Write a protein that binds this ligand. Sequence first.
Ligand code: NA
Ligand code: NA
Ligand code: NA
Ligand code: NA
Lengths: 197, 197
Amino acid sequence: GTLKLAVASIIGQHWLPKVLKTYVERYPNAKVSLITGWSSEMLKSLYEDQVHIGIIRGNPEWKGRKDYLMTDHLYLVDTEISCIDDIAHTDRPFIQFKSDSTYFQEIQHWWHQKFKTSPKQTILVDQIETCKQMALHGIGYAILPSVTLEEEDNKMPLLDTKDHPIGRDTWLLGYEPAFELKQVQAFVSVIKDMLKQ
Amino acid sequence: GTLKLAVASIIGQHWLPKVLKTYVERYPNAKVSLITGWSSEMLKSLYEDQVHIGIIRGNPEWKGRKDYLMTDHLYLVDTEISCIDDIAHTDRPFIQFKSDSTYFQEIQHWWHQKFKTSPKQTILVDQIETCKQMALHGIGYAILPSVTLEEEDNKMPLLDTKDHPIGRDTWLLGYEPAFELKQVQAFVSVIKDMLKQ
Ligand code: NA
Ligand code: NA
Ligand code: NA
Ligand code: NA
């Protein structure tokens, strides 16, 4: 049977391929169709019956099954700047992801509460991986979730006013019937079987 | 002030950073607002005056200014397979990108013509970078435009029945009023400078 997934974009790109590798590896010839996007768009997709499973970010309201999956944390990245305080004075441009989720407002709030000022809006982008690439090309600094980071060329954790890392969840949503279907069960399996680490 | 761009995804990821790096290097503190996506979506967004400039792949019809930018060529990539004839038997999955552009149709047509059979619709993905990533993780093989490839990690040129590389074009689009703006002209300048490299 054919598994129809809706995955948030950064998840689709960075976390899911190891998941799908093992899923393909123990279930040869099993079909997978994958749509990606903003959590909001994939939630809306899931709701309207287009997919079996949604892998959504944030805190989606959902009246079916919802599995917490994981949590990651916000990092400021730049090629030059090594000290997060420096960004208050920086003239290096700020490369901001903005969508309809809370991501953007969370960062605006952290910034307002950390530096007692507004961040300069210069570069606005609508997808997170683009912000990452533009940061990796030295254009400016970005704030990315650690699920999108590796041994790439400076990463500085965001901590709130009480020294706590911020702060973002990934869930697995779906209605009951989907979890009745088998390949969904083998996929949820592979996920929870993988996460054993 | 404030350039509003709409850019096909792989361009946004792989080619545009270079260009924005220079655009910023040359005009510090110039505001840039970027949206990304399928070529059809970015053309729509441009058609509706939501942006200044669109960068669009394929062969868009356009009753305004259209500049050809570049061509790139299709490669079959896989971690195991070295020889592109084998792909007709391998039973490794074909990770296949599919949108409402003609990318998919054109690869289908090539497949049918070259191998005289059909390809196995197992994995279907809605963004190209995810095919790349899924291919880089050994899941299966992918057909990717070279604008998304580097000295990476096994690539075999797609050639039509008369041994000519199969290509895809990328264009820059706008209506005349946009091209009168100093920031659109500066951006276009950085672009037409960069194409000589
Ligand atoms: Na969203
Ligand atoms: Na940077
Ligand atoms: Na399109
Ligand atoms: Na493809």
